Amino acid sequence: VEPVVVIDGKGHLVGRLASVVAKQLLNGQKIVVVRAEELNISGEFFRNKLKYHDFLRKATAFNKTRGPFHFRAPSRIFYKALRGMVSHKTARGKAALERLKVFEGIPPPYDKKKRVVVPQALRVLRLKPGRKYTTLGKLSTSVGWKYEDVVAKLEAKRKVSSAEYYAKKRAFTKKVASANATAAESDVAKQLAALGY
């Protein structure tokens, strides 16, 4: 029902999240994806490390510039797993890729909107308890992404600013719940309780 859906990346998978976004991008919905450094991959860390160096050695022999580009950014690795799920070579696929904005961390334009999760894409509702996981931010640093420290510094900065907003919000909803103390004993609340409200 929202015009722009903001999906948090923390605690989600890759292939089960890119599939439930690339279908929604072909439906006319705009989806932005933030905090991609906390995205998780099933399996242990060294296996998902071997499945990237097996792809890192895949390039065009006579000119490595024209070969497959090997991106280190976790926001772009997730975009690589999503552009394979969209027919990007057609004009319809080029319009679905303009509907997305995948970021690293939570940007100051997209920090005051409510983020959602996809319950068929969490790392905990799909995996068995006792299986090994792989953080995409820890994977990208080990293969050549240089921007883990500049994000976690700024990620710890917004959490100080988001805790001051929530401490104001929980002190305000308490005043709303205390203003509903006079809503009792009235004849209007005894008529809304009989209509399901």
Binding site: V1, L26, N27, G28, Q29, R92, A96
Partner: protein, 106 residues
């Protein structure tokens, strides 16, 4: 009131198609809020109109409307087929199409 919507908003998904063979005469309209084919039985026979715009004054109105209706259900997730008078131009995939409530049953 702030709202004046007397229709149900919906998205055009695709045509009726195979892996490669497509049928442009029958489209696929997703209804928001419908996830079962038992809930898609109410929208059977409702007139679907696609409101778009243009630049030529043909009636003193840039807005041009193509018409259609509901034939049957599709799949299990609540996808609703729709045949149109003139077919949708295949660029309007994922475009908001209007689904009215008339002819009503209630």
């Amino acid at each position: 009131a702030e709202s004046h919507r007397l229709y149900v908003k919906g998205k055009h998904l695709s045509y009726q198609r195979s892996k490669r063979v497509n049928n442009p005469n029958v489209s696929l309209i997703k209804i928001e809020g419908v996830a079962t084919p038992q809930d898609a039985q109410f929208y059977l026979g409702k007139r679907i109109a696609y409101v778009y715009r243009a630049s030529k004054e043909v009636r003193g109105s840039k807005i041009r409307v193509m018409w259609g209706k509901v034939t049957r259900t599709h799949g299990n997730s609540g996808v609703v087929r729709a045949t149109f008078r003139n077919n949708l131009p295949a660029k309007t995939f994922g475009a908001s199409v209007r689904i009215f409530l008339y002819p009503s049953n209630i």
